[PDB]
């Protein structure tokens, strides 16, 4: 530990997290509008400056450990759900959202955030623009698109485009009243998905950088991977697909420097 080297991708840009969290109109549980965020440095101070979360609980990572780690693919999914069923977005849970509106895969490494949104996402006549599904042919698969709303019949008699008893209307749209209790008030929710291995990061926290010193014992940090050791010039060839290597022992042994594309060893 003679020094402390930390190198992250040199690219920098304010992430579109601000416009993701501040959109004037969010999508429904009917269609989770998933938009890609990449090629920017991720800063969570704007998220903290945003409205106080009613429930910010995050899996596979901790909000303290959130800033240093570099995420490869971040995907902000937005939707509006009933305050009663806020706890249902957690994986391993069942509920109307879970059965038919949308699923979260059990092995989820991301953040879910919700905040009371009757402040401005409620109209006295109700926000019927937001809709949900009572009925579906089966259980919806995790992270699977569902954008079709065709007339469904519970009974054996086919509908043939005709609605009636045992053949209920396809989607139900809830109109939030300001008078509705906190349980029934609308909630704006944002869901983030992360991936940490075998991919280029292109999404990192603000940590600046310092050049490495070859053949010097350092406690390094590469793309959020914390390790200590001597950095040695290497001759083993890596294809563009893989960035950091692996040994028999399953710990890291090789890495390609983000700023200068060149493969380094992680020998002790």
């Amino acid at each position, epitope marked *: 530990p003679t020094e402390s080297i930390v190198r992250f991708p040199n690219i920098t840009n304010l992430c579109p997290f601000d416009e993701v969290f501040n959109a004037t109109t969010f999508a429904s549980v009917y269609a989770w509008n998933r938009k890609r965020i990449s090629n920017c440095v991720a800063d969570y101070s704007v998220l903290y400056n945003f409205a106080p979360f009613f429930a910010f609980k995050c899996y596979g990572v901790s909000p303290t450990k959130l800033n240093d780690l570099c995420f490869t693919n971040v995907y902000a999914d937005s939707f509006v759900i009933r305050g009663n069923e806020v706890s249902q977005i957690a994986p391993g849970q069942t509920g109307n959202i879970a059965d038919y509106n949308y699923k979260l895969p059990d092995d989820f490494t991301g953040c879910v955030i919700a905040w009371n949104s009757n402040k401005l996402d*409620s109209t006295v006549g109700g926000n019927y623009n937001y809709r949900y599904r009572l009925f579906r042919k089966s259980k919806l698969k995790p992270f699977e698109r569902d954008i079709s709303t065709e007339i469904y019949q519970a009974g054996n008699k086919p509908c043939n485009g005709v609605a009636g008893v045992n053949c209920y209307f396809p989607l139900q749209s809830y109109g939030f009243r300001p*008078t509705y209790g906190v349980g029934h008030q609308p909630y704006r929710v944002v869901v983030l998905s992360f991936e940490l291995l075998h991919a280029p990061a292109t999404v990192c926290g603000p940590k600046k950088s310092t050049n490495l010193v070859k053949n010097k014992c350092v406690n390094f940090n590469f793309n959020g991977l914390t390790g200590t050791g001597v950095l040695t010039e290497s001759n083993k060839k890596f294809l563009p697909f893989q960035q950091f290597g692996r040994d028999i022992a399953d710990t890291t042994d090789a890495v390609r420097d983000p700023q200068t594309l060149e493969i380094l060893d992680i020998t002790p």
Partner: antibody
Amino acid sequence: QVLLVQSGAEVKKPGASVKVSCKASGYTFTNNHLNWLRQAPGQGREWMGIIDPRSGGSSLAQKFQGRVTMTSVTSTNTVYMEMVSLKSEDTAVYYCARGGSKWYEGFDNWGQGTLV
Amino acid sequence: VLTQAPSASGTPGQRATISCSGSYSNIGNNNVYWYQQLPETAPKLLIYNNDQRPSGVPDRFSASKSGTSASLAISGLRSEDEAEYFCAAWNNGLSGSNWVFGGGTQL
């Protein structure tokens, strides 16, 4: 100047239906909301509910939901209330309140009220 | 639910304040706005969005909130102007959400 029409004072009769109107002035009717709260002497103040001017929709407090009906009409520039099974306790003074959007919780004008 | 508020007696040429007592759901999260009233007179808006007075209200007055308590200060309160005041905050608690007004003690 913003002016709100006050319905005249009315005799209170148990088991009767009354209507009260508040006609807007000093502003365009549809742009800004109008909601209602009442005062009972010897007690605190309480809020009826809010009606949308442009859409005409009404949202009413659960505490007194169902006893009162509110309908907003463009030409009338006013909203009506209904009273079903008027009990002697419920008779009181009722104020109209005018404000902006829903998040603009602050009411910027006031109603004269009805008292006998 | 309603703010308890204290009781006051005016003293000429003296700054006076009115404080409200509410829950976290009543006043902590939702901003408050004040309403100065005099007998045989209609209500009047006093402060707007919990931090500033509306346009046209005299600038001598200042008000602020500290959690459950919001202090409405009157610059050199006069006994003739002195009257009971009352908070006006939005409540959203359990199955019910509504505007809650805590009538202060008679002044």
